[PDB]
Amino acid sequence: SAAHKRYRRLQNWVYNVLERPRGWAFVYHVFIFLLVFSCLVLSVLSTIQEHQELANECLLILEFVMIVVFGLEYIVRVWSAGCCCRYRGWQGRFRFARKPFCVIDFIVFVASVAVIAAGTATSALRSMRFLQILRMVRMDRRGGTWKLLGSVVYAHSKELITAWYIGFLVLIFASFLVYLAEKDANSDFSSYADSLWWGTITLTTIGYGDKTPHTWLGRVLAAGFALLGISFFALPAGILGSGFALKVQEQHRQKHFEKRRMPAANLIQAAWRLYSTDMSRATVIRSIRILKFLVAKRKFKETLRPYDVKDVIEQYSAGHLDMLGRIKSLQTRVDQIVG
Amino acid sequence: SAAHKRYRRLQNWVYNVLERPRGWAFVYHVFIFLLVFSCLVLSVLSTIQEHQELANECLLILEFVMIVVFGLEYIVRVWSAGCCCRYRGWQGRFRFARKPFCVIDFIVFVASVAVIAAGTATSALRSMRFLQILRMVRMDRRGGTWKLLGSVVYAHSKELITAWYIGFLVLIFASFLVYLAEKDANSDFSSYADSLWWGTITLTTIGYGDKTPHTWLGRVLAAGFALLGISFFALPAGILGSGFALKVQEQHRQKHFEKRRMPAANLIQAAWRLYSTDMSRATVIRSIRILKFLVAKRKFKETLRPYDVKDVIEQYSAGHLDMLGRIKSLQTRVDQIVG
Amino acid sequence: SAAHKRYRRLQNWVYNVLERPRGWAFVYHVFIFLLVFSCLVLSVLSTIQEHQELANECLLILEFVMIVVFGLEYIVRVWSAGCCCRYRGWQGRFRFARKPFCVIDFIVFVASVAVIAAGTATSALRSMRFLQILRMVRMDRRGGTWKLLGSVVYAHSKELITAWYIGFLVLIFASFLVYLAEKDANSDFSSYADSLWWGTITLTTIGYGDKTPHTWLGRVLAAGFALLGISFFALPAGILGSGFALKVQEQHRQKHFEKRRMPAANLIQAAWRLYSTDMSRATVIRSIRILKFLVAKRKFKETLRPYDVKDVIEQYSAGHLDMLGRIKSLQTRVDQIVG
Amino acid sequence: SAAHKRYRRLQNWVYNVLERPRGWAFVYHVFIFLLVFSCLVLSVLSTIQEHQELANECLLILEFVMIVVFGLEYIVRVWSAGCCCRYRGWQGRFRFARKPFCVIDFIVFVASVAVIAAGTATSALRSMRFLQILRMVRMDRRGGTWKLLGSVVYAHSKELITAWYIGFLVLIFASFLVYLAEKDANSDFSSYADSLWWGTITLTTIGYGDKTPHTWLGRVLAAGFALLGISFFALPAGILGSGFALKVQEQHRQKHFEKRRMPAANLIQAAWRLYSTDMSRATVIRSIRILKFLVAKRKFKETLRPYDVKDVIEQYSAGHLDMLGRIKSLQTRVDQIVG
Amino acid sequence: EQIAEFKEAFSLFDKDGDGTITTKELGTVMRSLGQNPTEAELQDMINEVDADGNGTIDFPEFLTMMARKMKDTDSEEEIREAFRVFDKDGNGYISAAELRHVMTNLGEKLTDEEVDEMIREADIDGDGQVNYEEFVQMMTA
Amino acid sequence: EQIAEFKEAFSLFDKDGDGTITTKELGTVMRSLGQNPTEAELQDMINEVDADGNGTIDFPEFLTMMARKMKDTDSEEEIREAFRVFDKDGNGYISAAELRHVMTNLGEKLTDEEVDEMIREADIDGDGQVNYEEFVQMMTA
Amino acid sequence: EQIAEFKEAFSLFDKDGDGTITTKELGTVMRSLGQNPTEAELQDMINEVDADGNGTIDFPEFLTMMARKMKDTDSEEEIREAFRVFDKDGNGYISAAELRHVMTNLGEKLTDEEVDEMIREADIDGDGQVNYEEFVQMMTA
Amino acid sequence: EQIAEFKEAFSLFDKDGDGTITTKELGTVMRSLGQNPTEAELQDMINEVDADGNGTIDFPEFLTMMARKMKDTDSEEEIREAFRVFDKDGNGYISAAELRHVMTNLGEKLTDEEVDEMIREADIDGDGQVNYEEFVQMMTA
């Protein structure tokens, strides 16, 4: 197994390469992001007339680079994962599971490149392809930024509903009132739909200025309703931002409570002792080891609590027992002397 | 009572249907919200000329759906509530109490539909009706989003007053100064009212761009006052958003302290024992049970506190008593030996 | 002193009237605020042409109301304060101290009204007068909203400086870069001053749209610098808003710790006992009472702390002493038996 | 050394002058900031035509003031630092280390002034020079506002990445959709680049209003995507602002825990005792002093913790030992009597 | 007349006519009936109605407690919150067998006969489920 | 001369001429007058004026305390805050009978004669209500 | 049949046929095998599976624990989190010698023979590094 | 050679050649020199350098401590922070007399002769003010 020892050292470099996407993700991920971003910006600039043809040849030479880099990196990742512990077979299936829909778009874009070169709107199609690629490469860590956002927005669902609802109510009131205020003076507000559009650009504080009140009643209504609702169209940002800061601060304190050594160390031991009940060279005995394993798992999840919430009652019980022992001592002392 | 047993199982399905609006409110409430929303958007689109007549027939066929659905659901809710524990009579009155002004608008819109069909501005009237319906269906949980908003805004009343006041002061200063700056160059600022309007769209950061300074003094004043007051017109959103996040985080921790079992269990017992003083097959005795009930209610509201604020003093008292017992033991030991 | 007893009951109604501005300030303060506000809005509307003359007679009849109401309320407040405990003399001076510059403007506006009526720009002068009145009536509680704002902004001075500074740096970079980008294409950016103006309306997100980039380089610079600095021009609102919420939450918890009864009760007693050393019918003895007074004042300011920060060490000392007593007991027990 | 005693009192005034930039930085730093700011604003006004020539002579007379003030203050600071403890030599090098690139620009601008006067675009060059000066004088405290910003933004990197990413995704979706919606009706959206520009001014809520949707489909897409993404382009301000407030509040509490006297006092003693092992008139002995020094340094860094996190376990250990002593006492009492 | 009957009960505690009930007077009457409260339990009981904080109950405080019983809205809400601890469905119901387990196994456990009377008094449904919010109104009426 | 009279009082505590007052010197003079402070009360008293933190009072600290008494603004504010605890109306008034209850029933209770002198000294209104903020200025003058 | 074998083990604890296991029944069987748990350790063990909170284990709770062992996802995650405490690289590896130090020097230390069997069972790499996440799946299978 | 001299000191503690220093070995050498540490002080000392957390010091940990002394940047910063506690001006100076008070009156007080040597070693200015940041660099060099 000496050649297979070189094979294992191969996997050593293979996992060492696995290190870069996870640990020092900075350089690799950024360079690949620049690849995708450059393709995007060059497509955009190819749309505009000023620089068109040279951008076209650059697009060709860079889409070759895209396809070859992705082709290389497909094999790179597939083999870079667990080579034989995540072996080529059914775990092979699980390497090309759903989220390698990225790989699927890779393959179909290979076909797109081949069609462009030898085979023969189109540009929009290719652009979309680059945008699907954009998405995937900026998200292949399963649920990531999405998971964080979802958790936090779910946490503040109750307040968010209020903000949304009240804001919407204010919008449809304001639009209607102003529409009535000058449906006859302004050609702008010729329809309630026009007023609703004006309301959407007056509440969010965009204010294109394409449609503005002209009557001194319309101006007053716009002013009042703007002052009243603009704030509501700006709450969700405030709530979410503050929730993020709170969560960050909380989690840094929770991790700062790094007390974990002994509970974590004991949990592995209780798990090994339970497991070895069924394979050691050495039912009621097993049931006892399961109960001890469950005690050790909890002690460990109590260090995933900051061990402070239960501590108040913990020390109460300790002090109460001390006082009970003191009472007992005194009582028995009386029973010894006086009787 | 076997037919009445089937009647009770009827109420079983009746309360099971009650479950959906409260528990899994998602689907039912959303579908009904889509009904109302679709009616609204179709009315809006009926205002604009592009799609008018087909929207008109769709409006007719959908307002029939509105009226029939609401007619069904009136009976559905009225009977779906406590069928005979919230019995048809005086509790009947309380089922059609004030907030079923929703039911009142239902009934009057039934009449509106009948007037449109056989009986014979109008469109605005109907639109308003849909908006009252909009309000009610998005708010029939008594005080809900409104109650939460009111509580939080009341809590931060002091800061909010400051924001409002200072912002207003800055607005009326700035408008006046700029008006003086170019009441003669710009036709825009021909009145202090014009300047105030400009100030309302310059402070909130809407900036329609219909009225802008043109003199290099006006520009400087606008710049300075914008930099100084824009922030003030954006505080209320910040304060409210942060208050929401704080309240959310606080209440999740408070509920996370789910210690409640024993105090809650003992409270029901002290209440039953007090109640049964006056009806059990079994005045001073009652007075004692009232005092114990009040002790049990507090212990229970102390678990609606996170049992931490009083705990510091609680354990102090415990430890002090332990030390007092130690002192007593030592003293009596001396009195036993030395004397 | 029976007529003077009716005089004292007069002061009873006099202080009862004092109650309304402080306690249930709502109605009185709001009505007077409406007086001032109505005068303001009517002046504004008098500027515009649509409603001019009728607004003029309304202005006359309402400025009489202003002057008579303020004349009444001057005496009302002056006598409503401590009638003879804040007696008419040198405390009279302190009743008409500086902040009754409000009274000074009252008096001079009396003269203005007299000049308008019998005596004979002017309108701007009167408007300013109403604005000074506006300020005072919305601020006669010495330092109020101003004091709160100052405290909080001072607390976050360090972060605010950063926001201001970095924002300013970004502004002057961006303006300069874009100015160079199209000082030749756009007539808009014909001067660096023009660019700075554009930058002031592009950073704060007002965006009048009077001056916008037209070259594809200018657009890119504007986009990048906007994305980079807009956030900085919106930090101060965020910091202040969050600081307000934090302070509100903190102070509600601090007041929720209403433990104060006994320390507050003992402080008055130690103060009376110290004071009575020098006047009771009953130097070293006084020095002891001063030391006890100072201990009682601190215990009282420790309840203006939430009695939690020192409590950790407090109970440590208690428990340490208990353990020391336990050690001593054990030691002496050995010395009693073994020796 | 009496003349050198006057030299030392010179350094006394020299360090007393050092006090003003650090302690009461207000007046000196502000006046110098006004110098730089006035030069800037006068340059800007020199660009515009209204006031040009008089601004030119003022520019000359004020740039002389700039150069002479900076020349004075170079020597002032260089000598004002440690005169001979930061002596003129190799520490001289470290006085003119990198960040005195400010001094370098000083010197080269001396040459610029000389070139303008006797030696002979130019104006832009000089302007840039004033901006480099601007930067340095508003930042010569090594890492300052920059360091604070970097720390906080790094702390919230995870949330910030989410905000950035999702916002960007929404931007490129929205721009593309609207571009497709009216690439044929509006001349505005004639290129996807045009749409992207519109998206940059529609997401950040600037809204120049130069390019707005005109088709009722474009308006709907713009409305929806604005409502969905505007919030994302406003999160970073919210997160950063809240993080600043949290950090401020936290650090004020941490410093409010000013318990430090004894641990800080003992640390200096253990350090002196260790140091004096190798020079006192008085290896294993040294190793013991190193261990005690390390214990004293930690006790001191435990007061740079708020001594609360470890205190829960600290007092647990104390109470546990008390109870263990109580158990031992009881046990030995039994062994004394019963045996 | 209701006030006079409360006064006569109050005077059994305050036999000396001092107008106050301390732990001595309260605990003495209780132990005469065969109860055995602790000193800390007697202090907690008095503290629930002692506004003066001096460790006594006076007649106005006694009368207020006796007139009020459990009829106040705070009592109705807290008792209903206690049942809801044991209502995981959130439908306002609790099983007869689950009520029986909680009443006889937690806290100051009810005897079998006590809990039998309690389940008899609730109008139990045919399934065996108890609507506890109408049970709370019968104790708060 | 006022400084010399403070020095003569200071020397009664510090009879050895060491320039310091410890718990021994302070507590010895106090018990000679029939007071009985605890050790923890003597430590608290010294700690209020011991800036050096070494458990002593020196003459500069003694003189500062004696010159200041209660005249400082911190004392006026805190005493006024203590009265406000018992002013629920917020009008700056407290009833003579309510002041009497608090003074004789809470804390280090005043005797009847002490509290009689205190109510005599406040210029009580005819209703029986005391303006305590002018009572605070008389003790801080 | 698996349920009947669990029932027969459960009946060794509950020899009286009462359908419950208290600290008496649990601790008695344990000490018969030469174990010496404390009372507080017996309470912790029962509390991990006692949903009724009355200090007992009934057969449904016993059967659930026995059927589940460590196969649940909570167990797999927490065990993997415990290994990660000792994986500073974050690469999912731990050295054989570092595993040996932690197992025999922390907590309820493994004997040499126990830890020898544990390192034999992990498919150790030629370097001497252990992939503990596949070690966790073997104990959770 | 410096490593060998550290090894010879390390072997005075670990006289058995076990490669470790426990509280027994450390405290025994200390008491032979007439020191009297407590058990809790010996545990704190070992814990400052015991990365294995098993209550011992091994030679690599001993060598690291001896090679480093106070030269590290953490030591320079913390010592400078300790002086700054007593520098209210914030100018980096402390009076000779104030240094003398703190050194002989707080903490593990220096003797007069110790503090005399300390003030002699600082290059005191003619006023009597000590620049403690250059005092910190002399102890960290």
Ligand SMILES: Cc1cc(C)c(NC(=O)[C@H]2C[C@@H]3CC[C@H]2C3)c(C)c1
């Ligand atoms: C009326 C209205 C007003 C607003 C500001 C929004 N937008 C949000 O609430 C944002 C916060 C999260 C992240 C994107 C959404 C959801 C919506 C949907 C409706």
Ligand SMILES: Cc1cc(C)c(NC(=O)[C@H]2C[C@@H]3CC[C@H]2C3)c(C)c1
């Ligand atoms: C001057 C001014 C500035 C602003 C931002 C507002 N708006 C608010 O204060 C909002 C916070 C709550 C929710 C809608 C209101 C109230 C007002 C009324 C006046």
Ligand SMILES: Cc1cc(C)c(NC(=O)[C@H]2C[C@@H]3CC[C@H]2C3)c(C)c1
């Ligand atoms: C560059 C710049 C950017 C901004 C947002 C501001 N405005 C603020 O900082 C506000 C917070 C308080 C309340 C009004 C001020 C001060 C300033 C002055 C300068």
Ligand SMILES: Cc1cc(C)c(NC(=O)[C@H]2C[C@@H]3CC[C@H]2C3)c(C)c1
């Ligand atoms: C998409 C997008 C949206 C936004 C708001 C930003 N801006 C930020 O995130 C600001 C927070 C710090 C301070 C200036 C930056 C960094 C960026 C870069 C990209």
Ligand SMILES: [K+]
């Ligand atoms: K805008």
Ligand SMILES: [K+]
């Ligand atoms: K705009």
Ligand SMILES: [K+]
């Ligand atoms: K605009």
